[PDB]
Amino acid sequence: MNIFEMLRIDEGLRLKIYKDTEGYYTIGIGHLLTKSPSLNAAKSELDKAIGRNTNGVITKDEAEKLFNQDVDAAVRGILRNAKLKPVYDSLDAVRRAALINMVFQMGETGVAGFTNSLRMAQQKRWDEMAVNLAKSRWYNQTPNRAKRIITTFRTGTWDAYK
Ligand SMILES: [Cl-]
Ligand SMILES: [Cl-]
DSSP: OHHHHHHHHHHOOOOEEOOOSSSOOOEEEEEESSSSSOHHHHHHHHHHHHOOOOBOOOOOOHHHHHHHHHHHHHHHHHHHHHTHHHHHSSHHHHHHHHHHHHHHHHHHHHHHOHHHHHHHHHHHHHHHHHHHSSSHHHHHSSHHHHHHHHHHHSSSGGGOOO
């Protein structure tokens, strides 16, 4: 199992513009296009992202290319973040994947916001962190996914995804 497979499981894959769990225009493998309620604005963004006139549809290869960029960006975003870097550096390989995932879904700013869970992660207090992560809007809005990430952090294994 790895980060790509893991996120592909959590986000799915759609070749047409769609609305996420929060109502935002998205496409491919969890690629957020815009927060604006306008479909046109979403279409413009998509064309701009792909480099062609898409008419709201992409191909699998195109989806994957956006995905690659997105993972890379997430990783890099974590590494440049003062609050995130240290955490990431302290973790093992599976848990790092859990952190990348959260960053992918919610942005660097959002995760940097889980201050208390981050501190617990650094102290390697697994069960406490899992309780703390649960007390969040994130967990209340997308509980199944959150559960998967939580287990991952708690156990340091890919059991939730097998
Ligand atoms: Cl982009
Ligand atoms: Cl969910």
